[PDB]
Structure formats: structure tokens, C-alpha cells
């Protein structure tokens, strides 16, 4: 799962979608003209996303990735450097510890707040 957590870190820190084997639980169209529809592969999920908390967490992660992709598309940048805000996200090493622990939630909330900050700044000033 090193590769999968690397891909998830890429999606949550840059919004970059790269799933050539259909193993990630998030993919969109345009791989309505500007709006692409995202589809959540239920077979390759990491959780059941049945409870309201799990559904809200999945929605938050998906919205973070979508906002990252939107910022990249608007700024015409291939990647978003970490200096764009005061928030940094470290890569995941142990998948089991990330699952049993709330450090996953820490990273998710941190990158979500970072993306919200950046998006609000760019829309209020740009």
C-alpha cells in the first residue's frame, strides 16, 4: 500500500488524479463544458462510508482534491508548492497506523483548511 498512500497523498495535497489501474476511489470525467463529474469507485474504497461521519470525511477529502485541481487549473500551474500557505502535509508511511489512528483525520482537516484558505484568498483578492 505504499503506492496507494502515495497516490492518496498526491490527491490530497495537489488534487492530481493518476489511477491507470482503477485502484483509487475517486475519478472524474474529461480525462458541463467546464464542470466534470467525479465518480467514487465503491469497490476500491478504504472505508464503508456508511455513517454520516464517514460520508462527511469522504466528501471533505473529495472537495479538498477538487479545490486543489480547480486552483491548479485557474493558476495554470502543474503543482501547488507548499509555500502557498502556512500549512504542510506529510506523506503517509504506515497505512495501518493511519487507519487505526486519527492522524489521517489530522492530515485531512489540515489540508482541507489549507485548501479553503488558499481558495478563499484567491477568490477574495484575485
Amino acid at each position: 500500500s505504499q503506492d496507494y498512500c502515495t497516490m492518496l497523498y498526491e490527491w490530497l495535497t495537489q488534487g492530481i488524479l493518476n489511477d491507470p489501474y482503477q485502484e483509487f476511489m475517486t475519478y472524474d470525467d474529461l480525462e458541463r463544458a467546464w464542470d466534470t463529474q467525479y465518480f467514487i469507485r465503491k469497490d476500491v474504497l478504504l472505508r464503508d462510508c456508511d455513517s454520516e461521519e464517514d460520508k462527511n470525511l469522504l466528501f471533505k477529502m473529495l472537495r479538498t482534491g477538487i479545490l486543489l485541481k480547480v486552483v491548479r487549473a485557474s493558476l495554470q500551474i502543474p503543482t501547488i508548492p507548499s509555500n502557498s500557505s502556512d500549512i504542510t502535509i506529510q506523506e503517509i508511511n504506515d497505512f495501518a497506523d493511519l487507519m487505526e489512528g486519527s492522524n489521517l483525520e489530522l492530515y485531512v482537516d489540515k489540508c482541507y483548511s489549507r485548501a479553503n484558505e488558499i481558495f478563499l484568498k484567491l477568490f477574495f483578492q484575485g
Binding site: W34, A73, S74, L75, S84, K121, L122, Q125, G126
Partner: peptide
């Protein structure tokens, strides 16, 4: 096309 911001970049 895309709408560009009002010339405000970090």
C-alpha cells in the same frame, strides 16, 4: 474560456 483573476497571484 476560463475567467482569469484580477492580476493577483501569491
Amino acid at each position: 474560456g476560463i475567467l482569469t483573476p484580477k492580476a493577483e497571484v501569491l
